[PDB]
């Protein structure tokens, strides 16, 4: 008598919420959140560096 069995690998049902993600990171960009006070005039700004 014969029995055929096969198996395979698939994503887990929780992969939508529990997954690590692998990135390639390069060319960082710097920003600053500065309080600037000039001549009694104050402002809060975001400045690209």
């Amino acid at each position: 008598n014969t029995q055929v069995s096969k198996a395979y690998v698939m994503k887990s049902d929780d992969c939508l919420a529990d997954h690590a993600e692998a990135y390639k990171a390069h060319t960082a960009s710097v920003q600053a959140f500065l309080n600037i006070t000039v001549g009694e005039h104050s402002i809060v700004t975001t400045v690209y560096v």
Binding site: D13, D14, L16, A17, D18
Partner: protein
Amino acid sequence: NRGAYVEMHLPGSEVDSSLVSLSGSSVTVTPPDGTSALVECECGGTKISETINKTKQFSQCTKKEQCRAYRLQNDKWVYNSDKLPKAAGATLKGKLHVPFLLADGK
């Protein structure tokens, strides 16, 4: 119903040795009420008698051990488990959503 799913499949025939009995020193298959039972026998002349619904007496086979009765359901689908025999042909019949999925909280 979130993203996840599993597959519900057409079940395979489940052998039942209670159907086969020895009535008059000859085998007799009594399928359950309103259910087919394919009878496969290997005595003199192979028996492939599928469409029996009420009762069938086989006198060719004199022993219960040389006949096998398989219950046929073919109406309610089952999970694609590995501890169940596979039905012939295409079996994929639908998708069952997976409850209690992992979720974010505090």
